[PDB]
Amino acid sequence: TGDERFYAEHLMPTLQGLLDPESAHRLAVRFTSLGLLPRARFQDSDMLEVRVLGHKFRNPVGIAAGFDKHGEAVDGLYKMGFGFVEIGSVTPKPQEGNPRPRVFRLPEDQAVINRYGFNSHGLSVVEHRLRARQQKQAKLTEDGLPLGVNLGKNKTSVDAAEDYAEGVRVLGPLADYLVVNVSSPNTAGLRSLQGKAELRRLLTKVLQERDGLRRVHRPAVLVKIAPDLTSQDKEDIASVVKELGIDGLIVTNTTVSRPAGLQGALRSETGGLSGKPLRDLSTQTIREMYALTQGRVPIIGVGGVSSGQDALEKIRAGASLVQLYTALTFWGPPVVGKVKRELEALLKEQGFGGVTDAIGADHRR
Numbered sequence: 001t002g003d004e005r006f007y008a009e010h011l012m013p014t015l016q017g018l019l020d021p022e023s024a025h026r027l028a029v030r031f032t033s034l035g036l037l038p039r040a041r042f043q044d045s046d047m048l049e050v051r052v053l054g055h056k057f058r059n060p061v062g063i064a065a066g067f068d069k070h071g072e073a074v075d076g077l078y079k080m081g082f083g084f085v086e087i088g089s090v091t092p093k094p095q096e097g098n099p100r101p102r103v104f105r106l107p108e109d110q111a112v113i114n115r116y117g118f119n120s121h122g123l124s125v126v127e128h129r130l131r132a133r134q135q136k137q138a139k140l141t142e143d144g145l146p147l148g149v150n151l152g153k154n155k156t157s158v159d160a161a162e163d164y165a166e167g168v169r170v171l172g173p174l175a176d177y178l179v180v181n182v183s184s185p186n187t188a189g190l191r192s193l194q195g196k197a198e199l200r201r202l203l204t205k206v207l208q209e210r211d212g213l214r215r216v217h218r219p220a221v222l223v224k225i226a227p228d229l230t231s232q233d234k235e236d237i238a239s240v241v242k243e244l245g246i247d248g249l250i251v252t253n254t255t256v257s258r259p260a261g262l263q264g265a266l267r268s269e270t271g272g273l274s275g276k277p278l279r280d281l282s283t284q285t286i287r288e289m290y291a292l293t294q295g296r297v298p299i300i301g302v303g304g305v306s307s308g309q310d311a312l313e314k315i316r317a318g319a320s321l322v323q324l325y326t327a328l329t330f331w332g333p334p335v336v337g338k339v340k341r342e343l344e345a346l347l348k349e350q351g352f353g354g355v356t357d358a359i360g361a362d363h364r365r
């Protein structure tokens, strides 16, 4: 479309040249929350529909956690064309996160580095925000547009498990799925929660709290993992997931690695790297986790998706759903319709009746 090219060539670079990344993001969140968006043209066909996690998803393309940290733009995000929305990460108490600047663009690499450190309005503010539209969400969900809530922990928290348990109790009843985020590179000691003993202990507590919720308010529980795990870590995670009956995995968060070939002046900034240089590392992690869980644990694939091909590669590798964030930073809102339209065309070209037929197809070759 001409809208794609206008945003890609004119609008986004001009926004970029004018505002630093954090300011541009705040403005984007504001515009989104007010529905100030280019025409919602693409109509989802039935072949994009997916049933997973106890829900119908009208299309498999979602917005990744981090864009709407505080639950302010949910409805604007559905209007943008996402088949599902994930907000967060949300920490139990409000906290400011790291000192600025804490987000950096690498235009030459179509990548972003961020070290926000879980800036969050906190559970109580997000709870009230979600309660104010709770019944509208219930209809959205019924209509195939579910809501996920991603949980973090406070910087000064002594007991990580209790932070997550609080999140489950407070936001669990408002969510179609919860995400236990143990893969942020920007909170000290957080990623060590991916280790086998700590993870089993953490998730047992999380699942107990979840199971104590009334039935209609009882979300699926997913774990979001890093792209930088050893083979040992991945095998352990797969084992804990199957031992405890975890409902799904989100694969993956940003990388602390700096792949060879990065050109951006800011490539050596501390933080998690997202976007294009993350893409295949993410796709390969999905492929491994799908195999280790025997295709029985739903995976949401995320990391450097900016096209239908990117989405389909993750789906064929084993993802039932995909998410994007960074692509929006460079292509703007038209990227959502673009990904969906290309995905549908590729599914037809490759002989799939629909998205469901494509999930894990690479493993059956």
Ligand SMILES: Cc1cc2nc3c(=O)[nH]c(=O)nc-3n(C[C@H](O)[C@H](O)[C@H](O)COP(=O)(O)O)c2cc1C
Pocket: 064, 065, 066, 067, 069, 088, 089, 103, 112, 114, 116, 118, 150, 181, 224, 252, 253, 254, 274, 275, 276, 278, 302, 303, 304, 305, 323, 324, 325, 326, 327
């Ligand atoms: C600026 C920024 C903030 C993010 N904040 C969160 C977060 O709070 N919680 C989380 O689980 N992931 C967070 N992420 C990670 C994304 O959800 C996603 O896993 C990652 O960026 C890879 O996807 P992408 O290449 O499409 O951006 C953040 C990513 C970025 C770029």
Ligand SMILES: Cc1ncsc1C(=O)Nc1ccc2ccccc2c1
Pocket: 028, 029, 031, 032, 036, 037, 038, 328, 329, 332, 333
């Ligand atoms: C201000 C405005 N008026 C009509 S469309 C429009 C607009 O393009 N808004 C934007 C512009 C850029 C965006 C980038 C990411 C997410 C949402 C975004 C919304």
Ligand SMILES: O=C(O)c1cc(=O)[nH]c(=O)[nH]1
Pocket: 089, 114, 115, 116, 117, 118, 119, 181, 183, 184, 185, 186, 253, 254, 272, 273
């Ligand atoms: O808040 C952060 O800085 C943040 C959290 C997370 O999960 N992933 C990320 O890249 N950054």
